[PDB]
Amino acid sequence: VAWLRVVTLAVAAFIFNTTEFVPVGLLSDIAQSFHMQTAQVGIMLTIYAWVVALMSLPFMLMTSQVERRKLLICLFVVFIASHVLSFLSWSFTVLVISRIGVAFAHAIFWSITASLAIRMAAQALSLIATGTALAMVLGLPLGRIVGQYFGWRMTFFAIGIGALITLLCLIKLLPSLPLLFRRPALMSIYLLTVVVVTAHYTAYSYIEPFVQNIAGFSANFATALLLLLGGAGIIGSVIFGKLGNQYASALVSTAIALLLVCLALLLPAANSEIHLGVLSIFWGIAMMIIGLGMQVKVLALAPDATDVAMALFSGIFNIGIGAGALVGNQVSLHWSMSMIGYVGAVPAFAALIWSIIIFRRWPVTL
Numbered sequence: 001v002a003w004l005r006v007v008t009l010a011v012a013a014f015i016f017n018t019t020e021f022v023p024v025g026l027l028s029d030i031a032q033s034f035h036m037q038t039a040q041v042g043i044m045l046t047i048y049a050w051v052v053a054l055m056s057l058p059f060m061l062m063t064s065q066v067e068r069r070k071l072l073i074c075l076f077v078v079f080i081a082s083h084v085l086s087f088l089s090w091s092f093t094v095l096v097i098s099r100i101g102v103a104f105a106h107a108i109f110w111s112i113t114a115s116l117a118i119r120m121a122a123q124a125l126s127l128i129a130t131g132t133a134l135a136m137v138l139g140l141p142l143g144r145i146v147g148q149y150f151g152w153r154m155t156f157f158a159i160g161i162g163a164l165i166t167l168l169c170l171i172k173l174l175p176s177l178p179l180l181f182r183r184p185a186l187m188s189i190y191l192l193t194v195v196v197v198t199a200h201y202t203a204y205s206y207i208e209p210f211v212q213n214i215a216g217f218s219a220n221f222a223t224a225l226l227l228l229l230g231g232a233g234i235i236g237s238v239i240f241g242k243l244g245n246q247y248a249s250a251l252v253s254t255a256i257a258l259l260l261v262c263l264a265l266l267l268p269a270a271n272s273e274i275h276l277g278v279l280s281i282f283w284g285i286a287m288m289i290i291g292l293g294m295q296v297k298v299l300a301l302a303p304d305a306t307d308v309a310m311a312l313f314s315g316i317f318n319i320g321i322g323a324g325a326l327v328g329n330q331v332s333l334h335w336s337m338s339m340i341g342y343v344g345a346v347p348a349f350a351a352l353i354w355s356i357i358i359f360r361r362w363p364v365t366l
């Protein structure tokens, strides 16, 4: 019952995190159906993200008063309704309105999920994280291939059904802030996160219309990279799993360094299928190391109020996604979408330094 009552959430984290990134493999399709240009559709990522940023904190506030599995139901219900609206969406406006619906559930979910794994008890958090992790590897790739044969609306409708079958699996298994603002080390971590995420989502958001409209390759080759990155992620995630309980500083910095490289070398490694592919192998490995790197450290640094740690982590993570989407959008629209790799490499340089600085300053851990 423990493993189940938690594996059900680990799955549940897979759904929410799967959803928000699926648009990355669906920009062309979504654009085609609405007679706009790829990058223009990129903003539904920012809108989503920034709603999760704005509401992660106020929503949990209001919601924590009354917080049974009841709340998960109403998330899932809204999640499921919104996803039905995406499928029916009769304008790119209606689509993005639907994305807010999801984001409202998203916002609330990810405040809560940190604790609940523990309340059914631990290492409940790896499971959650495994789900988080298995989103990039199975979720997003398979979401593209579905969007290939069947198109984007079915992809969105599909996910809505998961939420249900998992909701039903869910129902069968049932029953502050100034202190953190005054942990500079935690704040510094919250800082590093915001920045490095913007760096990565400058580029990663538009990788599809990049591999298609800019590097010239097939829409199959794009889908190919997305698989490679996900699995690259498995390597990355299991490098950490086995080696992140120590070495956390060094891994994270070298990772961020690796990311730096990849972002700079995006345009030069294009026109070299094998090149972009390796890039993908390294990029991916960096992505998960950095991604889990922060979650682990925030939790470490905030034992007495983990969920509020995580509530902040959630929101402040989503600033970076909207940031990177938007800057990625704007470079693509106004100067060239080839300079997304380079533009993003600027926030990544800063982060490398900030990384090394703060790990020197606070070597304490465990």
Ligand SMILES: CCCCCCCCCO[C@@H]1O[C@H](CO)[C@@H](O)[C@H](O)[C@H]1O
Pocket (backbone or CB within 6 Å): 053, 054, 055, 056, 057, 058, 187, 190, 191, 315, 316, 319
């Ligand atoms: C102040 C210097 C910036 C350093 C980063 C410290 C975290 C503060 C960022 O605030 C953000 O704005 C939202 C608006 O409501 C809030 O919900 C929530 O706090 C958070 O997502």
Ligand SMILES: CCCCCCCCCO[C@@H]1O[C@H](CO)[C@@H](O)[C@H](O)[C@H]1O
Pocket (backbone or CB within 6 Å): 195, 198, 323, 347, 350, 351, 354
């Ligand atoms: C010279 C010493 C370097 C140490 C300073 C740490 C880097 C913090 C910069 O973050 C800024 O925050 C914005 C998000 O709000 C970003 O979008 C913006 O591009 C970036 O400029």
Ligand SMILES: CC(C)S[C@@H]1O[C@H](CO)[C@H](O)[C@H](O)[C@H]1O
Pocket (backbone or CB within 6 Å): 017, 110, 111, 129, 132, 291, 295, 310, 313, 314, 315, 317, 318
């Ligand atoms: C980049 C993805 C992991 S999204 C990210 O996951 C985090 C930890 O799993 C936080 O809980 C955020 O709420 C969520 O948006």
